[PDB]
Each structure stands twice: as C-alpha cells, then as structure tokens.
Amino acid sequence: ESQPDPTPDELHKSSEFTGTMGNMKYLYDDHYVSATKVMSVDKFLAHDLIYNISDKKLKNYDKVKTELLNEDLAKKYKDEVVDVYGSNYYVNCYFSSKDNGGKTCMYGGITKHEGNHFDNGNLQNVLIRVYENKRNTISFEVQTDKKSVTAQELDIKARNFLINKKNLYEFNSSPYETGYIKFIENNGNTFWYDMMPAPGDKFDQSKYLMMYNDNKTVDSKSVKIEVHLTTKNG
Ligand SMILES: [Zn+2]
C-alpha cells in the first residue's frame, strides 16, 4: 500500500550536486501555472494534454502542455472541465509533431472543477510541519480552494514559503544537505518526494518535475504534511 520512508542512503545530497541550485529554486519561488475551468484543446504524445492558458504575470506563454503518467489519465481528463496548478519549465519543453505565443510544459496538476470546492466558498488550510535534524522547529499553513487537491499544489506552496522563511534553496546551493516532503493521508497511506536535486553538475528540471506526472491528489481537509530536512554535516 504505502511507500516506506526514505532509507538513509537513498536521499539526494546537496553536497553531491555541483550544478546551480538556483535552477531548483526557480521551480518553486513564486512560480506556477494556474487556471480554472479549462478543457484541453490538443495533444502531442499519447499521455499529454495541451490547454490554452495565458501567463497573466510575465506574459511568457499562452499554451500549456501537461504530461501524465500514462494514456489512461490523459483520456480521463481530455474532455473534462478542469482546474490546473503546477510548476512549469521551458528548458527542453517540446511541442510539435511536425510544426504543431509562448509555450510552456509541466506534469500532472489537473483536477475536475465540478464538485471540488467548499460549500461555504471558503479556503482550506493545510498544516505543514517542518523538521530540522529530527526536531519540529516550525509549522505553517498553506491554503487551497480545492477539496481534492494535487500533492503538487501543496508541495509547491510549501516550498515557496520555505524558500523565503528558511532559504530552502539559494542560487549556489542549499543550507540543507538532505530533504523530503512526506504526505500522510487519513486512510493511512503515505508517500514522499525528495526535495534535493540528483547528484551531478547539471540539474534537469524536466526530469525532476516528472515525479508529479501521476497527478496524485489528496483530501485537503484531512491530509497531513511533514517536511524533513537535515544539515547533518555542516
Ligand atoms: Zn474549480
């Protein structure tokens, strides 16, 4: 059922990442694609959906392509009126089956609009507990207007806060050696994401965000979230 917690040796170590940590920071620092009540208008590969979504802010795109884990998810949402929320990237963001107004890519991040909001039109708060070297140092709340929200949306909002409050990621590196965000559902299921970039000297944004392609959703009203970081070394 649930995924076992991280073994000590498998977690990505920032001390083993020689690339630019700023490239990771870019993915969660006041950075996200947001849309409400849209319906895909085209596809590239069998498991993706393309939406007409405009970048309100910087005006960097008007078309968004989101890849999903498989064809089945793609078909399920293809003609559905959905809401979108996720972290987009541009490096190696491919469109066109020949030749197929900026364009941007992402993974998962979709939820049906109908029946997914709170009756009193309010927002749901989700508690994030942060642990540094096994100690719960701080805890903060993030908000969502969805009853069933993608884990991606909650993760992004959590890291955006931590980037500012705890300098989770800086341009050169991170003050933390290890880090993972763990979700705990009210049915007992748990799963987590490694918050650090894979070892090497070149961060692959596309490859890292791919973990969100399962379009995993959780019940905002009952899910629990824990961020576990370590400075372990220095
Ligand atoms: Zn909606």
UniProtKB/Swiss-Prot annotation:
* Gene Ontology cellular component annotations, sorted alphabetically: extracellular region
Write out the annotated subcellular location.
Secreted
Q: How does it assemble?
A: Interacts with host MHC class II molecules composed of alpha/HLA-DRA and beta/HLA-DRB1 chains.
**Recorded consequence of changing H47A:** About 30% loss of T-cell stimulation
Cofactor note text: Possesses two zinc-binding sites. The zinc ion is necessary for the toxin interaction with MHC class II.
Q: Which GO terms describe its molecular function?
A: metal ion binding; toxin activity
Designated gene of the protein = entC2
Residues annotated for Zn(2+) 1 binding in this entry: D9, D83, H113, H117
In which organism is this protein found? Staphylococcus aureus
Which family does the record claim for this protein?
A: Belongs to the staphylococcal/streptococcal toxin family.
Spell out the InterPro entries in the cross-references: Enterotoxin, Staph/Strept_toxin_CS, Staph_tox_OB, SuperAg_toxin_C, Superantigen_bac, Toxin_b-grasp_Staph/Strep, Toxin_bac
| SUPFAM superfamilies in the record | Bacterial enterotoxins, Superantigen toxins, C-terminal domain
Purpose: Staphylococcal enterotoxin that activates the host immune system by binding as unprocessed molecules to major histocompatibility (MHC) complex class II and T-cell receptor (TCR) molecules. In turn, this ternary complex activates a large number of T-lymphocytes initiating a systemic release of pro-inflammatory cytokines. Also causes the intoxication staphylococcal food poisoning syndrome.
Query: What PROSITE patterns has UniProt attached to this entry?
Result: STAPH_STREP_TOXIN_1 (PS00277), STAPH_STREP_TOXIN_2 (PS00278)
Q: Which cofactor does it need?
A: Zn(2+)
What does the UniProt entry list as the effect of changing H117A? Complete loss of emetic activity
Alphabetically ordered keywords of this record? Disulfide bond, Enterotoxin, Metal-binding, Secreted, Signal, Superantigen, Toxin, Virulence, Zinc
Disulfide-bond pairs as recorded: C93-C105
Protein name in UniProt: Enterotoxin type C-2
- Identify the Pfam families for this entry: Stap_Strp_tox_C (PF02876), Stap_Strp_toxin (PF01123)
Instruction: List ligand-binding residues for Zn(2+) 2.
Output: H47, E71, E80, E114
